[PDB]
Design a protein around this nucleic acid. Structure first.
Length: 635
DNA sequence: GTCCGACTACGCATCAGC
């Protein structure tokens, strides 16, 4: 009756009686908002899943059509990933609507949200319009994302204001958080899926209301109930891993149930699937710890792109995040038949796209790959060539290869696909087991301009069932002593948002150009320190805050830190590679005439108390490390 | 170990302001 006191975390929660809306009527957003409250209140994931499951049970019982917008609102998504909807709502756009919402000056509201690290609390602080609807709020979110062209921003601000005026109680918090891409419930895809699997198992969909089954975990023992829901979750997890498309799963789920879901949502070309992720290992001996026979291929520094081929001849290319990248590769849709044999009529390969120079015939760094255009590229104006390095086969002429080992998948992969020096090659896989030649193959990969070594089993736990587990990642910056260690000067600091609200979330580091007797910014640092170390910083680091920057510091086109600090702290910082920065001035001119050097994948290691600012890593050295890189020393 | 959310550089794509 009154969604203002809605409680989805109640003991012995009844889907119908404990709800806050009438069946067949739309789901109110306050019901969704009060649950997010009960989810951010706790920290146990099994508690958040049960609380969100209570929403979905009430939703599947009272308003089945509203199930999809509730899920997307929970995931903070707008639809399937291959659709490509993006809010296009900047931060400043949101606080512009926030100031337009209440009435504070944009200079005042912009300061509050920065010091708080969250706009939801800032926005929450006329006649009442009708209460907000969950599916209608999701519609306004989609309406915002589709707004494009000139003057589209001011039209987005109107829609956001139209929601913030209709917000009741805590609704203003989660509309603002969702629009900025920071719901921060502690609950995401894995827990949303577990909560949706739970709901359709306790409250089966498609029941004549009032539903004859509101709690199907009634006559079950708690032991056999946990395995019941765990077996139900696994059926949903794997189906979603083959078809990560809630616009396809929910209609089939809502009508045929969870048990019959895999019989209709099958992995087929044209629909992207979740790719197999890797896992970072410590050292070479850390790999020999599971020790089963495995293979070892290079880890190529490019972009993950899986290539689908429908039976009808159409070819599509999706990215690691299911985003449609077919318009990005006209040079691939053309060279499609150059890799397949006559017997190939349908396929899906897990490849990595790396930039390839035609003249030198060598692999280019990652920066060259990300310089290609997107949207709708014409194959005539393609100035950055790309070469596929296939390392898995998922589909082959109507058949799905999910339940097959890497040893067999690699069989048909090499059997039904022809090489092409410069356009199509297989990831160089050296099958072995001895740790002597294994570490040798790893340090070789760098000479062939690669990140490191891929390690995946061949038979034992070697399927492509991403839901069950299984791959090992091994490059150079992981082993202690093999990474480029820089002793850098902390010159800037940035106020943190969310988890790091209050203290600093980032820091601006600098090398010491001994030639100009000045500090040069090189990169930012926001990972690699413990929460006690962050509290160890920020506090001891606050006694050195200064209003104006020192004259001997130089940041060029880097973000102005929220706090300038007296250069004194010297930090040990590990990094993967070194990058040619179009933003940072460190060693500007020492390699490229205009661009400096930045750190790729930097991270904090430890503070150097014995080291002084003058006794830190110089920009002069920094240039030699960029020249000593094998990806750079191959031109 | 899982899951989540802090955070990194780089570069295309886009739009308010001019």
């Amino acid at each position: 009756l009154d969604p203002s006191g809605y409680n989805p975390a109640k003991n012995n929660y009844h889907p119908v009686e404990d709800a806050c809306w009438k069946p067949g009527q739309k789901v109110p957003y306050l019901a969704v908002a009060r649950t997010f409250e009960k989810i951010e209140e706790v920290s146990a994931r099994l508690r958040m899943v049960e609380t969100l499951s209570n929403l979905l049970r009430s939703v599947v019982a009272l308003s089945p059509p509203d199930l999809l917008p509730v899920l997307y609102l929970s995931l903070n998504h707008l639809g399937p990933p291959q659709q490509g909807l993006a809010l296009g709502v900047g931060d400043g756009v949101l606080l512009k609507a926030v100031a337009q919402a209440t009435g504070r000056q944009l200079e005042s509201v912009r300061a509050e949200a920065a010091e708080k690290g969250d706009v939801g609390l800032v926005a929450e602080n006329m006649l009442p319009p009708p209460p907000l609807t969950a599916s209608g709020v999701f519609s306004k979110f989609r309406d915002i994302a589709r707004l494009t062209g000139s003057a589209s921003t001011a039209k987005k601000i109107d829609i956001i204001k139209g929601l913030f005026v209709a917000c009741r109680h805590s609704e203003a918090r989660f509309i603002a958080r969702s629009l900025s891409g920071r719901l921060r419930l502690g609950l995401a895809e894995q827990s949303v899926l577990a909560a949706l699997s739970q709901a359709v198992s306790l409250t089966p969909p498609g029941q004549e209301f009032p539903p004859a089954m509101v709690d199907a975990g009634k006559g079950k023992t708690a032991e056999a109930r946990k395995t019941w829901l765990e077996e139900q979750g696994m059926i949903l997890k794997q189906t979603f891993c083959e078809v990560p498309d809630l616009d396809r799963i929910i209609p089939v789920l809502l009508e045929h149930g969870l048990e019959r879901l895999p019989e209709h949502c099958k992995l087929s070309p044209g629909i992207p699937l979740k790719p197999m992720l890797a896992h970072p290992t410590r050292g070479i001996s850390e790999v020999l710890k599971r020790e089963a026979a495995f293979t070892c291929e290079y880890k190529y520094d490019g972009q993950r792109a899986q290539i689908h081929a429908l039976e009808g001849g159409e070819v599509k290319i999706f990215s690691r995040n299911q985003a449609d990248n077919t318009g990005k590769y006209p040079d691939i849709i053309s060279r499609i038949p150059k890799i397949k044999l006559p017997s190939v009529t349908s396929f899906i390969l897990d490849t990595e796209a790396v930039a390839w120079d035609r003249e030198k015939k060598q692999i280019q760094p990652f920066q060259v790959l990300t310089t290609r255009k997107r949207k709708e590229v014409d194959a005539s104006e393609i100035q950055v060539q790309v070469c596929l390095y296939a390392f898995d086969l998922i589909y082959l002429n109507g058949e799905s290869l999910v339940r097959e080992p890497l040893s067999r998948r690699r069989q048909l992969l090499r059997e039904n696909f022809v090489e092409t020096e410069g356009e199509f090659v297989f990831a160089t896989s050296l099958d072995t087991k001895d740790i002597e030649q294994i570490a040798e193959f790893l340090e070789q990969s760098v000479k062939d301009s690669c990140e490191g070594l891929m390690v995946k089993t061949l038979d034992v736990d070697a399927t492509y069932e991403i839901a069950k587990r299984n791959w090992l990642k091994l490059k150079k910056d992981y082993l202690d002593g093999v990474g480029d260690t820089l002793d850098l000067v902390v010159i800037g600091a940035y106020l943190g948002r969310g988890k790091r609200a209050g203290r600093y979330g980032g820091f601006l580091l600098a090398s010491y150009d001994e030639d100009s007797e000045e500090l040069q910014a090189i990169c930012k640092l926001g990972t690699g320190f413990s929460d006690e170390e962050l509290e160890e910083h920020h506090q001891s680091l606050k006694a050195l805050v200064l209003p104006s920057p020192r004259p001997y510091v130089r940041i060029d086109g880097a973000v102005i830190p929220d706090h300038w600090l007296d250069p004194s702290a010297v930090w040990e910082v590990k990094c993967a590679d070194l990058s040619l920065s179009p933003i940072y001035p460190a060693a500007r001119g020492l390699v490229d005439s205009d661009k400096g050097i930045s750190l790729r994948f930097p991270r904090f290691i430890r503070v150097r108390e014995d080291k002084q600012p003058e006794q830190a890593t110089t920009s002069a050295q920094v240039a030699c490390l960029y020249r000593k890189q094998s990806q750079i020393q191959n031109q």
